[PDB]
Recover the amino acids of this structure.
């Protein structure tokens, strides 16, 4: 027998939870299928525990400036286990909250792994029971990528971000491989907390898809903070030794000859090279649901799959892999399906991002190079500044703040904002609202500054 | 003999410096008269040294959460002199920078006290030499208010914010009198750094001209932080004792009888009750320049005095006593006079403010009560939230974040934003740009959130 619902959601992470809760508000009879822990990647092995560890890493820098600010320094060591336990308890509190959010909304929780059946009417099976609905959302997320053994023998001796959140002790020596925001964030946390840390990157700079100013500055701040950035470098092999792992690296700097280097006595090797969508065991083939070669579910601008009555949102689609994007796409879909708003969809332009580096990065809109491509070089003007935040006026340790505003056409429409510096994590949201509204530079310059702040520098560029 | 300029600016603080520099960019032959230190109140006894001391007071709270974040605590004491010396050096660096800014712009620096003469053509005298121009800006600022002895015998035993910045040691016991942002800020700094601190206020709450939510929350956070808030209380007399000062207080709570209390062994009594404009010795009468009963120079919307060719900006006019306001009004005036832009003026609506409390406050636009008065009760809707920032998910000490959005008319135009919480100091500027642009709630809700942050809560209110 087959139980019918108005809305069946596969995955109880950011996007699935948000979509199911909004549908239920509109009257849908909904169910969420979850094989592991409610809250998905964000709550369990993502945004939330990452941010707790970032706040911890900030405590390591307050510690270094304490004498400069008039206090006698602290001179004793970090205890990873203390914060690990507290972090785990917070995750458990959130798991209980999201279970209650579904129950309070009268959303059924189906525990187990869903896969599609070959029934012509779209139907899933979970633990040998069948469920159907006229609307089925796939919101199954992704997972970390690890190299194949055939490519990098010994790769399985490394961990990913998932294993990072299982660590019970600070690794003495860490090597992080990759050059995106997860690699950056994990390297910065491990180094701030006292691991002897290297970040191994294929080119000269991290965050190369970000504005060139951010890519440069982020790389410089990593080095200034004590992270060893191993440029033009790749792992060839990993071996277990008596003292941890030995990582065999090849370095090939332009203008130089390639060189092989062994990195001995590594405690933690962390692969932060990408994410793979979680679709292998969904039986998508049984209904002919379209994927790319990497397993991402293909969707249109309304989150429709190629099969009527089946949708997908969030990381499983491979576009803009952020919690607020999954949530917004999920809610817009709920209003389309259950409020009959045919034009309800997410705009994927001007989505803001923060990277929790040291100091944090904020960006929204087009890089300078993207703007030149779209508008023409003669129709783009940039304004920028670099300064030392007043926090550091009295400290021996320094960080900088860099900001870039990208403007298009005669009116100087603000089409991109890019920055790194103290406070940039909390500064960006409001500027993103202004950019989404089509703010011009005149709109920024007509807004009176707030002094003394870093944020005022964005409204006083000349 | 009389030297002539295009532009004569009386006072080398925020507004005078900004106005003179912009005029000189437009070709004006300008001079700045300064009797004390370039940079005025902001650089020397205001924004800048206040902010250094606020950053210091934040170091006192990182210290209290260090064990919770896995570090062994710091257990030794603050040394006021360390940071005082560093703070003074930074002020000296800024004095040298602003002198150079004028010199590099070919702006003459006239050192001494200016007063108007009785010459029918507006002319000032400084150290017995006369100067004239077709455009004279009065930008002389203000000074702290202290009670008259006739009113409060012994009031002169107290200090003001000026004396705060001369303190060479942390006072053991401090009593701050007043209920505005300076009183709040000074009480919070002194208490965080270890002074046994009381804040004496005439009514039940601080910041009563701010939105009611902020007034309430700020008072609660002061008390939670250990500041003793002495409500419905006023100073009657101050006496020198063997052990500091004795403050005689009268307390008169509604519903209760008045009571007199002596507060013994006070080391620092700080008056933070208002500001008086710096106009007493300008000889304004010699030209009939109009003032109010408190000595403020009266101006129109274009900063004109009642006398042709004479202007005033900044604190001397008594309206919106902030550094960015003096600067913006000064620059808009320079473009009016020297770029002939007859409509160039400052809009005094939607000026954003931050109060450096613990945690900081940010506000822009109308309070809920101001919006109801302007638009009608049936045409105002508020949205609000209160939460604990994720920073405190793992700490025993707590602070809250409260946010209020005030919306007008069917379209829900955002006419006010009010908040207190970690990060609110850097969060506000961008939201102020959106409000100045006429953002609606739909504009906020159409902007994708940044997670995990406090700032995302302002774009996800329901
Ligand atoms: C280390 C790290 C840090 C990050 N930091 C941030 C950050 O600061 N900010 C930000 O915005 N984003 C961040 N992200 C990204 C964010 O976590 C993801 O974009 C977001 O979780 C994706 O949500 P989702 O709904 O697509 O998938 P997920 O949250 O991954 O949820 C998918 C759910 O589906 C369940 N599932 C899968 N297959 C099945 C099946 N067949 N049957 C039943 N259940 C199934 C899974 O168990 C899971 O709970 C971070 C991610 C990582 C890994
Ligand atoms: C404790 C405190 C904290 C503050 N915190 C902030 C803050 O965080 N943010 C913010 O925006 N604002 C803050 N302010 C307010 C800010 O300092 C003032 O709004 C701003 O300095 C006013 O600028 P102004 O140009 O009007 O006057 P001022 O900067 O006061 O400059 C006037 C100048 O005129 C000179 N002068 C006066 N009379 C004469 C004369 N006849 N001849 C020659 N020279 C003369 C004075 O010596 C002085 O240098 C703070 C103020 C105080 C007191
Ligand atoms: N400007 C913006 O607004 C941007 C926002 N983002 C946001 O961040 C999300 C995640 O992006 P991002 O952090 O770039 O993600 P990635 O998962 O793509 O980052 C991993 C990076 O590591 C490198 N890498 C890939 N494979 C290997 C390998 N086999 N060995 C070593 N290194 C490898 C690549 O960088 P390299 O080529 O340098 O080696 C790659 O970009 C996006 O989906 C988007 O939401 C991302 C980019 C820009
Ligand atoms: N909502 C907004 O946007 C607001 C912004 N601001 C900004 O802040 C600037 C400064 O304002 P604010 O901090 O209010 O300034 P004030 O200098 O006016 O604050 C001093 C306060 O102390 C109290 N006080 C006055 N005289 C006495 C006395 N004799 N004894 C004891 N207490 C006394 C009063 O409060 P009480 O009546 O409670 O006793 C008074 O408001 C403004 O010019 C503006 O730029 C100010 C208000 C609102
Ligand atoms: N704001 C950042 C950076 C620190 C910073 O601002 N430091 C400068 C001194 S600030 S105090 C004097 C005041 N300046 C302002 O209010 C900023 C004006 C803004 N730049 C603008 O263009 O509107 C003032 O009196 N200005 C009058 C004038 O600008 O003419 C500074 O000088 N830095 C230079 C240095 O080398 O230190 C933060 O707070 O971190
Ligand atoms: N953001 C502040 C406050 C801390 C906070 O957000 N805590 C909550 C858990 S966040 S992780 C799960 C994620 N939630 C979000 O991305 C926020 C969505 C936002 N509220 C919105 O409405 O868009 C998610 O999976 N959400 C899916 C869903 O919302 O359905 C939390 O639960 N707090 C409650 C508590 O009692 O702790 C900060 O970062 O400080």
């Amino acid at each position: 027998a087959v139980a019918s619902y108005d809305y069946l959601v596969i995955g109880g992470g950011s996007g699935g939870l948000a979509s199911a809760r909004r549908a239920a508000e509109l009257g849908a009879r909904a169910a969420v299928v979850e094989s592991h822990k409610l809250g998905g990647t964000c709550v369990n092995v993502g945004c939330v525990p990452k941010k707790v560890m970032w706040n911890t890493a900030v405590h390591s820098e307050f510690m270094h400036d304490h004498a400069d600010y008039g206090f006698p320094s602290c001179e004793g060591k970090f205890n990873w286990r203390v914060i690990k336990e507290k972090r785990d308890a917070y995750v458990s509190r959130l798991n209980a909250i999201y279970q209650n959010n579904l129950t309070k909304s009268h959303i059924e929780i189906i525990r187990g792994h869903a896969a599609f059946t070959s029934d012509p009417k779209p139907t899933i099976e979970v633990s040998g029971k069948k469920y159907t609905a006229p609307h089925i959302l796939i919101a199954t997320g992704g997972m970390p990528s690890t190299p194949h053994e055939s490519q990098i023998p010994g790769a399985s001796l490394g961990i990913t971000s998932d294993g990072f959140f299982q660590l019970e002790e600070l690794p003495g020596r860490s090597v992080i491989v990759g050059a995106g925001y997860i690699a950056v964030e994990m390297a910065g946390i491990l180094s701030a907390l006292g691991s002897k840390t290297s970040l191994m990157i294929r080119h000269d700079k991290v965050l190369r898809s970000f504005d060139s100013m951010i890519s440069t500055n982020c790389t410089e701040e990593l080095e200034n903070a004590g992270v060893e950035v191993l440029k033009f470098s790749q792992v060839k092999e990993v071996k277990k030794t008596l003292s941890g792992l030995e990582v065999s690296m090849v370095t090939a700097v332009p203008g130089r000859l390639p060189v092989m280097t062994m990195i001995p006595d590594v405690d933690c090797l962390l692969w932060a090279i990408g994410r793979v969508p979680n679709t292998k065991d969904l039986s998508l083939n049984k209904l002919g649901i379209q994927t790319d070669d990497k397993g991402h579910i293909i969707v249109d601008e309304f989150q429709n799959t190629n099969v009527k009555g089946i949708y997908a949102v969030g990381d499983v689609c491979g576009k803009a892999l952020l919690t607020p994007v999954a949530i917004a796409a999920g809610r817009k879909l709920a209003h389309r399906l259950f409020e009959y708003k045919e034009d309800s969809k997410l705009d994927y332009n001007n989505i803001p991002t923060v990277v929790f580096s040291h100091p944090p990065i904020g960006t929204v809109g087009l890089t300078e190079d993207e703007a030149i491509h779209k508008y023409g070089i003669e129709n783009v003007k940039t304004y920028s500044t670099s300064f030392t935040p007043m926090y550091h006026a009295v400290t021996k340790r320094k960080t900088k703040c860099v900001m870039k505003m990208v403007c298009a056409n005669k009116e100087e429409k603000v089409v991109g904002i890019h920055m790194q510096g103290l406070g940039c994590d909390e500064m960006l949201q409001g500027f993103a609202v202004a950019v989404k509204m089509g703010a011009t530079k005149a709109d920024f310059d007509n807004t009176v500054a707030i002094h003394p702040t870093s944020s005022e520098e964005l409204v006083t560029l000349r």
